[PDB]
Amino acid sequence: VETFAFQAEIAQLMSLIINTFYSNKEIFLRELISNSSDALDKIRYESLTDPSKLDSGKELHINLIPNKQDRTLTIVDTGIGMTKADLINNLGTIAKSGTKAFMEALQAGADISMIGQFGVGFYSAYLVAEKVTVITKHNDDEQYAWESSAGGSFTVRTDTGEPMGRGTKVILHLKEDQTEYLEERRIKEIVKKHSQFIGYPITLFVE
Ligand SMILES: Oc1ccc2c(-c3cc(Br)c(O)cc3O)noc2c1
């Protein structure tokens, strides 16, 4: 298990998300589904010239898996997946510059819901999650698990869990007061409101 420090700017972003009074937390799901869509677009694009890229899984989709016993909401996609380097480099984002822009926008009157416009939507997960685990598999790398409960550090390890063919799984370990996001009707509402034009099947698992 390797432990890394967040860049100061990203730690600042995370504290802002965790500490700011802001009621419209539901947008985290839109942001994660958008990320999944982007990753699915990437593997589809690659497959247009090299169909063997889909040998690790032909179906391009997004699954939403609530588990009330574990208090987790898991978002699974069969997108391109991230390499170990992607994970370490802020989950494939340019988060330092994105955070700078986001901060400046907030000071000018923007609100947290606009986070995705700055390319750092992943971190909105911390609106509702006390811990986030990201399991990922790219065609050109091994399966890795990234994890952070904020507090300035994240870990990366090779994943010995259930193998995924290809793609990314974001496991949200929800805060005690945010269990509404495990309820079918609430999740359905959010998907319908914010993700109407995502061009991949979004399947909400039931329990
Ligand atoms: O260059 C990239 C950037 C992000 C992702 C992702 C990804 C990252 C997050 Br974070 C997420 O929530 C969902 C994803 O599919 N999978 O593969 C990628 C490749």
From Swiss-Prot:
Entry note about domains = The TPR repeat-binding motif mediates interaction with TPR repeat-containing proteins like the co-chaperone STUB1.
MF-aspect GO terms: ATP binding; ATP hydrolysis activity; ATP-dependent protein folding chaperone; CTP binding; dATP binding; disordered domain specific binding; DNA polymerase binding; enzyme-substrate adaptor activity
Annotated effect of mutating G81D: Abolishes ATPase activity
Keyword annotations for this protein, in alphabetical order, are:
Acetylation, ATP-binding, Cell membrane, Chaperone, Cytoplasm, Host-virus interaction, Hydrolase, Membrane, Mitochondrion, Nucleotide-binding, Nucleus, Phosphoprotein, S-nitrosylation, Stress response, Ubl conjugation
**What post-translational events are described?**
ISGylated. S-nitrosylated; negatively regulates the ATPase activity and the activation of eNOS by HSP90AA1.
By sequence similarity, the record places it as follows:
Belongs to the heat shock protein 90 family.
Q: What is the lineage of its organism?
A: Eukaryota, Metazoa, Chordata, Craniata, Vertebrata
What name has this protein been given in UniProt? Heat shock protein HSP 90-alpha
Subunit structure, briefly? Homodimer. Identified in NR3C1/GCR steroid receptor-chaperone complexes formed at least by NR3C1, HSP90AA1 and a variety of proteins containing TPR repeats such as FKBP4, FKBP5, PPID, PPP5C or STIP1. Forms a complex containing HSP90AA1, TSC1 and TSC2; TSC1 is required to recruit TCS2 to the complex. The closed form interacts (via the middle domain and TPR repeat-binding motif) with co-chaperone TSC1 (via C-terminus). Interacts with TOM34. Interacts with TERT; the interaction, together with PTGES3, is required for correct assembly and stabilization of the TERT holoenzyme complex. (Microbial infection) Interacts with herpes simplex virus 1 protein US11; this interaction inhibits TBK1-induced interferon production.
Function recorded in the entry: Molecular chaperone that promotes the maturation, structural maintenance and proper regulation of specific target proteins involved for instance in cell cycle control and signal transduction. Undergoes a functional cycle that is linked to its ATPase activity which is essential for its chaperone activity. This cycle probably induces conformational changes in the client proteins, thereby causing their activation. Interacts dynamically with various co-chaperones that modulate its substrate recognition, ATPase cycle and chaperone function.
Q: What is the name of the gene encoding this protein?
A: HSP90AA1
Tell me which Gene Ontology terms the entry assigns under biological process: activation of innate immune response; cardiac muscle cell apoptotic process; cellular response to heat; cellular response to virus; chaperone-mediated autophagy; chaperone-mediated protein complex assembly; mitochondrial transport; neurofibrillary tangle assembly
Q: Which residues does ATP bind?
A: N35, D77, K96, F122
Native organism is Homo sapiens (Human)
Primary location group = nucleus
Impact of altering E31A?
Answer: Strong ATP-binding. Strong interaction with HSF1, HIF1A, ERBB2, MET, KEAP1 and RHOBTB2. No effect on interaction with TSC1
